[PDB]
Amino acid sequence: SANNPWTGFQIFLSPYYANEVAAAAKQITDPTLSSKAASVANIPTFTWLDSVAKIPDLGTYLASASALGKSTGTKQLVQIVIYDLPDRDCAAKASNGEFSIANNGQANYENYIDQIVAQIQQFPDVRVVAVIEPDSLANLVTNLNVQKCANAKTTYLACVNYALTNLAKVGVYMYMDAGHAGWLGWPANLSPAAQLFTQVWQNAGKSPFIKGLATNVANYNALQAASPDPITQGNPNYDEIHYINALAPLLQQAGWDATFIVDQGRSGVQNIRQQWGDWCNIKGAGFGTRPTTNTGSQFIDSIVWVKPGGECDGTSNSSSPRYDSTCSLPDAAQPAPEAGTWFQAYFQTLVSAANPPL
Ligand SMILES: OC[C@H]1O[C@@H](O[C@H]2[C@H](O)[C@@H](O)[C@@H](O)O[C@@H]2CO)[C@H](O)[C@@H](O)[C@@H]1O
């Protein structure tokens, strides 16, 4: 590979996360633990554009990044997540979003992307790296018999295409979400997954800005497992390095020099789940390996922190329309607030259990 988006750039630290972390650390009673938690705001994370109201935030982040770059004599990089599909989260309930297909979803999303493009277009000196629509494509590999997913398949593909095609015109480096090793990493899923991703890549014109795929976003898999998690029984690809070593060659066969980024933001503590599919607020997770480009794998551009640890995965209140029974499992921290909202006790455990220690 030739073009790693991080080379020669300084990552712009998320002010949104920083404000959450500064607030959470002053509430942590242990003094050294509070110091460690406070330091989390200096670790680069991805900022989620999980609703239109966040688009002005992206405005202020690019402008701050531009200024930081001019004043420090560096080139700055802003890390974002495109996550506002119509009928979002089609195989769960916890992260249902603000747009729906039956309520002008297609148009709302295209306007969402347009407004994002118009922001990024005003700051050519700032590089952007985007993860494209967590969970969407993977749902279209394994969840087509889910009627919500099946009904939204063509909307998902159209919208993902619209994001890819139009963010490319303002030079955004993009990694399409590709699930994780327990999802698409199953050997029998590798080829169907690859066929989808290469179709999506081809449909977006094979633009050089489509770098490749992101894995483990908002999940907890090891990148390189010391020993296989017991939940991984039956899958030889028990960790993300196995998944990626098995999937990436298929992408290259079709001529896509595809590279990867891997969430490790909540991967510090392994063996914390009853079943692999337990994804919601897993009790006892720690912050994992810090973001770095020294990945040890020919396919991986960066270890990253995509899901901001401490922001909730979903509510445990079964009276909310966004209740998902996954968020009430014995390995899920409860009680838990609405997804995307701050979960103070979960953040403290992420700090305490961080591996490597903070
Ligand atoms: O990993 C985060 C997403 O997981 C999704 O559920 C997956 C799960 O990850 C797999 O381990 C397996 O259970 O397949 C599931 C899909 O049916 C979930 O739908 C999303 O809400 C999560 O963000």
Give a structural overview.
The protein has 358 residues and is an alpha/beta fold. It is globular and about 50 Å long. Strands 1, 2, 3, 4, 5, 6, 7 and 8 form an eight-stranded parallel sheet that branches. It starts with 9 loop residues before the first strand and ends in a 6-residue tail after the last helix. Helix 3 (55-72) runs parallel beside helix 4 and helix 7 (187-203) packs across helix 8. Helices cover 35% and strands 11% of the residues. The chain has a single domain, classed as 1, 4-beta cellobiohydrolase (TIM Barrel, Alpha-Beta Barrel). The structure holds a molecule of 2 linked components (GLC-BGC). A molecule of 2 linked components (GLC-BGC) is lined by residues 89, 91-92, 94-95, 135, 143, 180, 182-183, 218-219, 276-277, 279. One of its GO terms (cellular component) is extracellular region. Its EC number is 3.2.1.-. Disulfide bonds join 90-149, 280-327. Residues 314-328 have a biased composition (Polar residues).
Summarize the structure.
The chain has 358 residues and is an alpha/beta fold.
List keywords for this structure.
eight-stranded parallel beta sheet, hydrolase activity, hydrolyzing O-glycosyl compounds, binds a molecule of 2 linked components (GLC-BGC), EC 3.2.1.-, 9 helices, 8 strands, alpha/beta, hydrolase, 358 residues, monomer
